[PDB]
Design an enzyme around this catalytic site. Sequence first.
Site, PDB file in Angstrom:
ATOM      1  N   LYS A 162       0.829  -0.986   0.047  1.00  0.00           N
ATOM      2  CA  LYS A 162      -0.061  -0.038  -0.066  1.00  0.00           C
ATOM      3  C   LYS A 162       1.138   1.128   0.044  1.00  0.00           C
ATOM      4  CE  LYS A 162      -2.824   1.500   3.716  1.00  0.00           C
ATOM      5  NZ  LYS A 162      -3.715   0.972   4.312  1.00  0.00           N
ATOM      6  N   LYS A 164       0.820   5.576  -0.105  1.00  0.00           N
ATOM      7  CA  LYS A 164       0.154   6.824   0.258  1.00  0.00           C
ATOM      8  C   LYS A 164       0.047   7.711  -1.021  1.00  0.00           C
ATOM      9  CE  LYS A 164      -0.477   6.076   4.634  1.00  0.00           C
ATOM     10  NZ  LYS A 164      -1.644   5.395   5.116  1.00  0.00           N
ATOM     11  N   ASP A 193      -3.571   4.930  -0.599  1.00  0.00           N
ATOM     12  CA  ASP A 193      -4.480   5.420   0.232  1.00  0.00           C
ATOM     13  C   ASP A 193      -4.292   7.124   0.036  1.00  0.00           C
ATOM     14  OD1 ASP A 193      -5.643   6.316   2.898  1.00  0.00           O
ATOM     15  OD2 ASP A 193      -4.507   4.536   3.850  1.00  0.00           O
ATOM     16  N   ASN A 195      -6.071   9.144   2.516  1.00  0.00           N
ATOM     17  CA  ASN A 195      -6.056   9.536   3.874  1.00  0.00           C
ATOM     18  C   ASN A 195      -6.892  10.755   3.917  1.00  0.00           C
ATOM     19  OD1 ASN A 195      -2.835   8.424   4.148  1.00  0.00           O
ATOM     20  ND2 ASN A 195      -4.178   8.111   5.979  1.00  0.00           N
ATOM     21  N   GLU A 219      -8.577   3.922  -0.945  1.00  0.00           N
ATOM     22  CA  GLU A 219      -8.712   4.046   0.492  1.00  0.00           C
ATOM     23  C   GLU A 219      -8.745   5.389   0.984  1.00  0.00           C
ATOM     24  OE1 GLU A 219      -6.325   1.534   2.899  1.00  0.00           O
ATOM     25  OE2 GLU A 219      -6.318   2.800   4.379  1.00  0.00           O
ATOM     26  N   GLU A 245     -10.744   2.302   9.155  1.00  0.00           N
ATOM     27  CA  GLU A 245      -9.759   2.539  10.187  1.00  0.00           C
ATOM     28  C   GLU A 245     -10.054   3.692  11.114  1.00  0.00           C
ATOM     29  OE1 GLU A 245      -6.535   3.789   7.174  1.00  0.00           O
ATOM     30  OE2 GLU A 245      -6.284   5.341   8.688  1.00  0.00           O
ATOM     31  N   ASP A 268      -9.765  -0.751  12.637  1.00  0.00           N
ATOM     32  CA  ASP A 268      -8.745  -0.757  13.559  1.00  0.00           C
ATOM     33  C   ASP A 268      -9.072  -1.530  14.838  1.00  0.00           C
ATOM     34  OD1 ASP A 268      -7.457   0.973  15.863  1.00  0.00           O
ATOM     35  OD2 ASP A 268      -6.152   1.137  14.110  1.00  0.00           O
ATOM     36  N   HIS A 295      -6.240  -2.734  10.277  1.00  0.00           N
ATOM     37  CA  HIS A 295      -5.764  -1.554  10.248  1.00  0.00           C
ATOM     38  C   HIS A 295      -4.560  -1.576  11.468  1.00  0.00           C
ATOM     39  CE1 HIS A 295      -5.095   2.853  11.232  1.00  0.00           C
ATOM     40  NE2 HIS A 295      -4.392   2.681   9.898  1.00  0.00           N
ATOM     41  N   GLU A 315      -2.947  -5.855   7.223  1.00  0.00           N
ATOM     42  CA  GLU A 315      -1.864  -4.840   7.227  1.00  0.00           C
ATOM     43  C   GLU A 315      -0.816  -5.028   8.005  1.00  0.00           C
ATOM     44  OE1 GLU A 315      -2.752  -0.579   8.520  1.00  0.00           O
ATOM     45  OE2 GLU A 315      -1.794  -0.046   6.738  1.00  0.00           O
TER      46      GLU A 315
END
Lengths: 357, 357, 357, 357
Positions: A162, A164, A193, A195, A219, A245, A268, A295, A315
């Site tokens: 993964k 970012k 991801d 975020n 994500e 998450e 998470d 997560h 993860e």
Amino acid sequence: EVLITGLRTRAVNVPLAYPVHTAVGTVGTAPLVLIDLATSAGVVGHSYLFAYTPVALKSLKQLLDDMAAMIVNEPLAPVSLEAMLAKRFCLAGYTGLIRMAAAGIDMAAWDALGKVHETPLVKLLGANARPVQAYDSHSLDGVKLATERAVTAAELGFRAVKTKIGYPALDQDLAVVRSIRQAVGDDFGIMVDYNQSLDVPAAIKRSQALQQEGVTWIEEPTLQHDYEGHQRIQSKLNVPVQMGENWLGPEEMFKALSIGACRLAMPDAMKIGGVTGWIRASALAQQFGIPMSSHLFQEISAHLLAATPTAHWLERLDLAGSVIEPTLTFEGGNAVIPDLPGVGIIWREKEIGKYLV
Amino acid sequence: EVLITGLRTRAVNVPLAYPVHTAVGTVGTAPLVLIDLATSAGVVGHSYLFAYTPVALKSLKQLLDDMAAMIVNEPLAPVSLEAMLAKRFCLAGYTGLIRMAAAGIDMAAWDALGKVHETPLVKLLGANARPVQAYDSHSLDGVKLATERAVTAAELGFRAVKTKIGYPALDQDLAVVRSIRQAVGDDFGIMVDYNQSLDVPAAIKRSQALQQEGVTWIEEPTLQHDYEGHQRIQSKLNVPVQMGENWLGPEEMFKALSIGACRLAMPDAMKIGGVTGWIRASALAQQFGIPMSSHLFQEISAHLLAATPTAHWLERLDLAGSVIEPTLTFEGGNAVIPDLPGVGIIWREKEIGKYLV
Amino acid sequence: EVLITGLRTRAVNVPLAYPVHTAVGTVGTAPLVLIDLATSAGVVGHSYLFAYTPVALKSLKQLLDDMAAMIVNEPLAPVSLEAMLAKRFCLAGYTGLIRMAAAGIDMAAWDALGKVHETPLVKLLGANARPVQAYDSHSLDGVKLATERAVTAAELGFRAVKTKIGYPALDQDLAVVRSIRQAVGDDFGIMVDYNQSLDVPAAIKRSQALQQEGVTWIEEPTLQHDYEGHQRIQSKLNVPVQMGENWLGPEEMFKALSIGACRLAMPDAMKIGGVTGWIRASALAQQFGIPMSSHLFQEISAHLLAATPTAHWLERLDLAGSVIEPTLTFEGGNAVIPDLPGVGIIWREKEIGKYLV
Amino acid sequence: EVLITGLRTRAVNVPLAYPVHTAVGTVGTAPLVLIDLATSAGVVGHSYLFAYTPVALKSLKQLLDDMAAMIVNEPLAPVSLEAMLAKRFCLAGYTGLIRMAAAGIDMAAWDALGKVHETPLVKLLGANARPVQAYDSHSLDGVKLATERAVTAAELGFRAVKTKIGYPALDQDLAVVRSIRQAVGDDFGIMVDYNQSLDVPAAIKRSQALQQEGVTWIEEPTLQHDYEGHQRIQSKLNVPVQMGENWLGPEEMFKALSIGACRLAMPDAMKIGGVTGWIRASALAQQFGIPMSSHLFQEISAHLLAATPTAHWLERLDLAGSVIEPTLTFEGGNAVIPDLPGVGIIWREKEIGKYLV
Ligand SMILES: *C[C@@](O)(C(=O)O)c1ccccc1
Ligand SMILES: *C[C@@](O)(C(=O)O)c1ccccc1
Ligand SMILES: *C[C@@](O)(C(=O)O)c1ccccc1
Ligand SMILES: *C[C@@](O)(C(=O)O)c1ccccc1
Ligand SMILES: [Mg+2]
Ligand SMILES: [Mg+2]
Ligand SMILES: [Mg+2]
Ligand SMILES: [Mg+2]
């Protein structure tokens, strides 16, 4: 009969080999609260909590230390304990740091229950230990370092990474994904991801370009609490939207799944409510037909995912590797649960003293 | 490590002191299949299944005996076992008698897991044993016997009874409820069960008259699979509609709750999928905000309800009392869980031989 | 006036020339229960039931034998009989093996009614016999055998084949479809069946790649009871999603069609409730605008589909060919109904003795 | 130009003349964090936060003290500051204690902005000061004390009281309401608050009985996060359901209002996000047509409600009366905004030292 006799917490701030850079900020070190839950049976349960920023570290420890009085001399019965804490924080707000605090206790209490019965946690929950596929989680690393880390990950046997994204321009997002694909080949899983860094129009635009590149999932494209906005992005894509998450408790997951916010879920272990919250979340994911990943908290997640009907990916993001023994192993890209009572967390005491706050 | 080594079944047909008469037929005897699940650890798990009619008794036993080969030498891991059976019956239909068969195995496997760890099942699931309020369940008994049985039940300490209704005329339904109310006073809980005997217009009409009498709940007013029709009846009432004894698996519960079919739920431990199905169902009931009661299997339900966040009532209807020891007690209207490993089921062997089919 | 006088059942387990391999398991032999329904008029109705696995074979026979008492001396009136059985199994669960048992009786009772009036079943239902297009159903056979069987099928005059897919990799799914297309040409129908083996994200991904290959339909991409998940997959495709072989009764079909789970339907004559269940299902398919195909029971389905307003394809999968006379013929890819009273099933008695269980 | 130069916090625990007893627990003292926000202009902004339980008091103070570094030397621009804090806590969870901390800063920053311009906060927001009707909020006090406190409240000029209910029996709930009505007459407003203590069936039953007694509103009948369950209770009542004291931020209000959870709203100035969160919430309440009341923080709420288009009632519950000057007055049941710059909060320094933690 088995009673909780004490709660001890230690706040540490551990430097990370690669800071987790994201589009909305960087987690440079891991602020952790390490929990020891003492019992009348002579076993000690262990868990840790991740504070995300040093700003919330001392406050989280303090909250746990002040909470110690309401759980001491209670039976070591995590489902009953969780109901009592939900009720005690009814007026205050059983969410955020308070919920996270409660989850820390839960995780330690289930580790201690596993130690009382001398059995790995996954077997206590009624399931068999099995290898769970894991992806290596990297950060907003720029093209060169992102490609270097993905090649290392394939060499260590991981079959997916993964990265970012959320760079100023979409063309930087694509450049990173393409260079990784060039280096690791078309077989490899590339998760991306954002975020929460994009508004919905921007997320639809950038995600449809990434979908043509063949990414595994997209994500948290927009603000995490905006389930409706995630549903709107997901309806314009073939690739799955992944989130979860940031759900505090299974009740937040239930609201997001009820409106079709995402096709994949990744709770998470701390924010969802620990083991007790995870069992409830896996029952939800099963009925909504949602593949469920984890997560962080890779040590307890290896156990919880082997007990999860729609288990999808673990993860790998080793935040606590400096303070705990490497009992969880990764073999051929799969996490292998340790054959140890409870969760298998064993403190490296001389190392902890180096990071004590 | 702990392996299933055998499965033994015995079909018995036990006469009941009061036949369960309902508006759609009478259960005169209890056709039961008593299951013994042998393990490599030397403990034997125990459960039983209720066949409802002698017509399905031998067929259910036979199905379990033919299923024995796919679980022998499997690890005693009920969540993993359940997933394997779901997959093995994928093509055939993992519902009806096959699902019920699978649930029997599940219940016995969790009883055996509790015996391996020497702990009552409720404590193995992470909860504390607590007294669970129970109601005494009676049948379509006519005014005189219905009043006699309710007065006996109050004398034994029960604070609520369920009577069966669905007489030819609504005025007979009301006469029964009123005579019971006259005898036990206005404090007492009177639950009523129609056992699917009414069409939706008739159910709205009869239920609004019963609601004026002040009944606790109205149970299965129309065909059980008609969730939409139950939603339609429920929308015209203030009193709660209760159902769930006929859901085969948590996926059927999920469909009914998704459309608002009822305000209360009462899964049957066998039909919902055993302990593994019950944990999933309790997570659903919690998130939909549905108080959850039990149907039959009072011995294992006392345990499962102490672990159920929205636990509401235990149904006392002792179908297997002649063949098992009275370890479950009722004190002041509450069921008291036995302090025994597993579920606390201990066969009365000399009695079983009297009912063997 | 015409009364049912007896019910005789024989369980056989017949080896199949090609085992039906699927992504979730293999049906190596056909476990069948052959039913003879005796009447006071001197005609005997015939039907058979498919048990899917030998594990459920003896149990299904036993259930039918124990059920014999409630239908003997009842009028040979299949709609009235079905209502009585629905009511007798009200408490137990009129689904799974019990429903399938009831459907066996229904099919035999309509065959016997056709014999009393000396008329083919299709003409008794008020329709004319017409040739119904049929596709040849194959299994998860791998590229080489899948291509060999499809070429044989075109040579026998079939204009479409169904292959099973759900290989570990999507690229194996595509390789099979492409090699078949190469061999039989672009005119030919290639149906594909996943047999519930994919989760929803995986099914969207694999189905959009197959849609580019030009398949006729995509069958049961995910768990059969998950109507909502099928609706979610269908909304992302232009190609139709096909399902229905696993609906137990028209009430399950009604729930799936109400939410838009699929654009095509293929009820199984046994699971849908026999002839009585099929008439109800065809009325549903007509009003929802769903083309309706069949699953197995090709002998009675040729009759029921000529009476079905939105009749689409007959599935040719000859499970009972070894024990019954070949009165149903396939000419130029069409099934031709026999001009025989009832359904046209005539046992090959010397062959049955070879497979008796 | 005007910069924040410092943040000072003091935790105090003040005893309350009447502990706030509720059905889910008692707030015996007021745990408060008093905030002083220093500016480069020489004015100091003041606010306080309510911690609900002493358990969270030191943790909240600590969090604010650790947060001081990210706001020092930032412009005194509360809308810009709020956006920066939302973004800084993006990964961690901008909710619970962190959100409450941020709201404390916001309230102090708007008080300081009002002091820079020498104007009462209500006039800075563009509105005129007006008297706002207030109700006196009492607790689960039992029949005798509840009636005594309501008679005192009418004598002080209040035209409505809120009592807490949720006693073991509905008949105790009604007895309290009836005795209050007897003493204060039929003109008086009696609000009732269940403090999340009932499940939905119980809440429908108890609320319809209270509705016949003529209560003003029914407040938080079930778990606060269950918006859907509140919608379900509200659909069975003519009397309004009131909630909102527990919404963390306007985004939670937006979700509840979107599904019709309640007919009235009462945001808490701290939990909704301070002045900046309140302006957003009032715009939401206006468009959804929801009369908007306040919860606690009566000093700043008198100001915010005079600027709120659908302003309904001010809740008088003086938690901080011992440490601040009585500049807010109640005249004839109306709160009168002080003609002071900012909010009008002036610490009683000698008293604070008595309660310092
Ligand atoms: C009692 C309350 O719900 C209210 O005033 O409405 C409350 C809850 C927590 C603290 C104070 C008051
Ligand atoms: C392969 C199948 O799904 C079909 O023909 O569509 C099937 C499933 C079970 C038994 C036979 C055929
Ligand atoms: C009477 C019943 O519905 C109930 O107890 O609720 C029941 C139905 C079948 C068997 C036993 C009891
Ligand atoms: C990067 C992250 O979103 C993820 O791993 O998915 C993350 C967010 C906060 C802390 C660690 C990791
Ligand atoms: Mg992430
Ligand atoms: Mg019932
Ligand atoms: Mg098929
Ligand atoms: Mg309140």
